[PDB]
Amino acid sequence: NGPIIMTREERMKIVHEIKERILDKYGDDVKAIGVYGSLGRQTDGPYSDIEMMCVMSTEEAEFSHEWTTGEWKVEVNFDSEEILLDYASQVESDWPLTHGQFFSILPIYDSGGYLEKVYQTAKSVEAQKFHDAICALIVEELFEYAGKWRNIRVQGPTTFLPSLTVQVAMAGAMLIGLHHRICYTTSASVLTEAVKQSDLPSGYDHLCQFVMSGQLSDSEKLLESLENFWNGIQEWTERHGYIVDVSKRIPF
Amino acid sequence: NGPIIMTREERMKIVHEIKERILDKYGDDVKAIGVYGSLGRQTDGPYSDIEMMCVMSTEEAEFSHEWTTGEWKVEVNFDSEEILLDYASQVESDWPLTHGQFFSILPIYDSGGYLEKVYQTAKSVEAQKFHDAICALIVEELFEYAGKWRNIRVQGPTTFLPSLTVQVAMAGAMLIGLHHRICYTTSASVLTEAVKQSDLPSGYDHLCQFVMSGQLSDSEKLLESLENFWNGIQEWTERHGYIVDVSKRIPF
Numbered sequence: 001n002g003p004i005i006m007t008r009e010e011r012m013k014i015v016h017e018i019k020e021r022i023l024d025k026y027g028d029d030v031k032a033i034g035v036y037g038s039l040g041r042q043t044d045g046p047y048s049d050i051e052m053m054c055v056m057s058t059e060e061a062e063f064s065h066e067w068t069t070g071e072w073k074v075e076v077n078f079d080s081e082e083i084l085l086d087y088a089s090q091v092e093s094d095w096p097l098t099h100g101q102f103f104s105i106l107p108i109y110d111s112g113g114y115l116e117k118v119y120q121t122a123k124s125v126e127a128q129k130f131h132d133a134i135c136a137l138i139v140e141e142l143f144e145y146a147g148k149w150r151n152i153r154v155q156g157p158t159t160f161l162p163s164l165t166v167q168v169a170m171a172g173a174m175l176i177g178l179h180h181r182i183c184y185t186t187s188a189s190v191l192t193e194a195v196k197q198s199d200l201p202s203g204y205d206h207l208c209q210f211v212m213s214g215q216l217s218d219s220e221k222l223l224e225s226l227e228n229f230w231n232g233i234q235e236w237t238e239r240h241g242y243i244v245d246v247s248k249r250i251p252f
Numbered sequence: 253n254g255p256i257i258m259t260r261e262e263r264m265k266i267v268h269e270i271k272e273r274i275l276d277k278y279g280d281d282v283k284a285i286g287v288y289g290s291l292g293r294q295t296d297g298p299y300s301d302i303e304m305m306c307v308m309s310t311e312e313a314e315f316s317h318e319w320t321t322g323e324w325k326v327e328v329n330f331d332s333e334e335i336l337l338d339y340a341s342q343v344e345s346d347w348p349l350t351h352g353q354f355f356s357i358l359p360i361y362d363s364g365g366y367l368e369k370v371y372q373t374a375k376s377v378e379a380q381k382f383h384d385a386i387c388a389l390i391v392e393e394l395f396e397y398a399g400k401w402r403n404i405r406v407q408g409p410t411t412f413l414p415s416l417t418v419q420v421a422m423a424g425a426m427l428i429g430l431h432h433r434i435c436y437t438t439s440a441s442v443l444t445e446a447v448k449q450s451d452l453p454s455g456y457d458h459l460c461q462f463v464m465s466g467q468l469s470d471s472e473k474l475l476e477s478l479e480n481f482w483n484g485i486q487e488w489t490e491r492h493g494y495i496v497d498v499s500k501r502i503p504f
């Protein structure tokens with residue numbers, strides 16, 4: 001029932017069993033095999049799972065195998081070189097959470113240096129893409145949440161406020177991550193690493209204190225804390241040049 | 253600054269300005285235009301935004317316009333009839349959260365009853381698709397969370413436990429929603445509607461109380477509530493036959 005305790009030696013044994021099955025099944029279509037996640041960083045804990053990535057020569061290839069044996073769980077990603085390089089060069093709103101997987105790949109097999117090329121791609125993204133992703137995050141995520149908690153203040157339900165506050169704090173950590181071009185190590189340390197950064201929006205550290213401590217029961221403290229962070233976003237975007245275009249009423 | 257208070261009449265005025273602009277720009281390539289979300293249900297609050305969907309005749313068309321004027325926010329989706337019908341018939345892990353948009357479409361323009369056809373498509377999905385989505389949710393989300401809180405119990409960090417508990421409760425609502433073929437009304441009512449259903453896994457209602465009340469500061473209580481809900485998942489799927497295949501050690 002659930003994940004069992006495993007050692008780093010047992011997980012690496014499973015990884016090489018999977019590599020041999022990938023090489024047996026696809027032969028010389030395999031360009032590279034690598035380990036990412038906590039195992040690829042060699043910081044896996046007793047209950048950690050396994051994540052692997054595979055680069056195929058078959059163009060347009062994109063599939064994944066993810067399973068459990070009842071005791072442990074594995075995920076193996078299969079991508080063509082172009083699909084993986086393209087995704088490594090796209091900056092979404094959750095880029096600080098997702099793209100850290102490309103900065104600590106443990107090489108297992110590589111016919112033509114593909115694992116190194118992916119690393120150089122994710123690390124050489126031009127500045128304009130982060131600027132555009134920040135403006136998209138403010139409109140698509142922050143402005144949306146602001147309307148939701150302002151509605152809760154006047155019509156409820158306050159039973160959603162703790163969940164929304166976690167989402168607002170997580171989106172703020174993405175904003176800080178995009179600003180500093182930082183990818184957080186893992187999901188469990190996103191908030192802890194975000195508040196340690198410079199150039200934080202005003203009120204973000206206070207909002208994070210509620211979420212990290214789990215004190216989300218005082219709705220009136222949370223709503224005032226959210227409104228201060230939203231005001232801190234307006235000063236922050238002007239301070240850093242991130243101008244969201246508001247001039248047009250219908251922009252198409 | 254931020255979303256402004258607006259009435260339902262002012263929001264519908266903006267919608268018809270957008271409809272008139274969509275018809276001028278694409279002409280007879282537009283098959284249908286509809287409003288979904290809270291405005292399409294006529295339950296929009298003072299701070300609610302606007303979501304619209306547009307069915308195009310142009311094949312393989314898929315794009316979206318999402319913007320703000322500084323006072324309000326609009327999102328308009330453009331899809332071909334085949335792409336939209338396909339998406340309405342695929343069941344993902346968050347299907348109970350996303351596909352409610354097809355059950356409360358407000359028709360604004362419809363040349364050939366396309367909006368009703370989309371409704372019939374999303375409403376006639378066969379049972380096996382929900383069965384497979386439930387098995388995938390258990391492995392990809394619930395089993396994943398179980399390893400993270402079991403790691404937190406032995407090595408921390410407990411500052412992630414409140415965020416993780418909110419995510420686990422939301423994933424449990426997806427499980428219940430997939431089982432009963434329920435689309436939750438809105439994101440703010442997911443937990444409120446999930447605990448009112450029948451045939452809940454044991455311990456889910458107790459875990460939900462922490463998230464709905466915001467009392468997520470007692471780390472040791474949360475870990476016991478998570479472990480009880482995880483045990484209730486194994487018994488729930490067994491009583492329900494939802495057997496996740498564990499027979500093979502490498503299933504490809």
Ligand SMILES: NC[C@@H]1O[C@H](O[C@H]2[C@@H](O)[C@H](O[C@@H]3[C@@H](O)[C@H](N)C[C@H](N)[C@H]3O[C@H]3O[C@H](CN)[C@@H](OP(=O)(O)OC[C@H]4O[C@@H](n5cnc6c(N)ncnc65)[C@H](O)[C@@H]4O)[C@H](O)[C@H]3N)O[C@@H]2CO)[C@H](N)[C@@H](O)[C@@H]1O
Nearest residue numbers: 037038051062077079084087097098100101185186187392
């Ligand atoms: N691979 C190239 C590229 O990937 C794209 O796909 C995306 C994304 O759509 C996809 O999500 C997977 C789902 O499609 C699938 N149904 C279930 C999988 N579990 C998803 O995998 C991704 O999400 C989980 C978490 N939900 C990640 O696992 P884990 O939390 O243990 O984290 C391990 C390491 O991965 C990084 N990380 C952390 N959180 C995330 C999230 N939320 N998303 C992505 N990466 C994350 C972090 O550094 C950590 O150390 C799992 O690793 C993750 N793969 O997955 C990929 C993006 O990874 C497209 N398929 C396509 O463009 C192309 O194939």
Ligand SMILES: NC[C@@H]1O[C@H](O[C@H]2[C@@H](O)[C@H](O[C@@H]3[C@@H](O)[C@H](N)C[C@H](N)[C@H]3O[C@H]3O[C@H](CN)[C@@H](OP(=O)(O)OC[C@H]4O[C@@H](n5cnc6c(N)ncnc65)[C@H](O)[C@@H]4O)[C@H](O)[C@H]3N)O[C@@H]2CO)[C@H](N)[C@@H](O)[C@@H]1O
Nearest residue numbers: 059060061062063064065066076077078079334335338339
């Ligand atoms: N939405 C369109 C819809 O579907 C079809 O269109 C296809 C097609 O446009 C495209 O499919 C890919 C092809 O172009 C390509 N030539 C081969 C690829 N294999 C196709 O991708 C699809 O193939 C498999 C299906 N067995 C999917 O992978 P899988 O089932 O294992 O995914 C499981 C979950 O894991 C996530 N995932 C998948 N791959 C990765 C990687 N590399 N890293 C991380 N996560 C991954 C995934 O999100 C999933 O939840 C694969 O996902 C799938 N894209 O894209 C669509 C896919 O249907 C029809 N032609 C079209 O008419 C129809 O409207």
Ligand SMILES: NC[C@@H]1O[C@H](O[C@H]2[C@@H](O)[C@H](O[C@@H]3[C@@H](O)[C@H](N)C[C@H](N)[C@H]3O[C@H]3O[C@H](CN)[C@@H](OP(=O)(O)OC[C@H]4O[C@@H](n5cnc6c(N)ncnc65)[C@H](O)[C@@H]4O)[C@H](O)[C@H]3N)O[C@@H]2CO)[C@H](N)[C@@H](O)[C@@H]1O
Nearest residue numbers: 140289290303314329331336339349350352353437438439
């Ligand atoms: N359109 C057909 C189909 O859609 C697919 O795309 C998905 C998904 O990828 C996409 O997400 C959008 C992002 O790509 C974009 N970067 C930002 C947009 N804001 C996203 O739109 C969706 O997510 C927001 C939530 N941040 C939804 O807003 P709102 O929360 O106010 O909810 C309004 C009503 O919509 C339903 N709902 C509630 N929560 C969700 C979530 N998380 N996802 C989807 N729907 C949700 C609910 O009933 C509520 O009453 C926003 O409405 C939503 N559109 O959006 C679509 C799915 O809608 C593919 N592009 C493709 O297969 C094809 O186009």
Ligand SMILES: [Mg+2]
Nearest residue numbers: 037038049050
């Ligand atoms: Mg892992």
Ligand SMILES: [Mg+2]
Nearest residue numbers: 049050051396
């Ligand atoms: Mg994982």
Ligand SMILES: [Mg+2]
Nearest residue numbers: 289290301302
């Ligand atoms: Mg809305």
Ligand SMILES: [Mg+2]
Nearest residue numbers: 144301303327
């Ligand atoms: Mg919206």
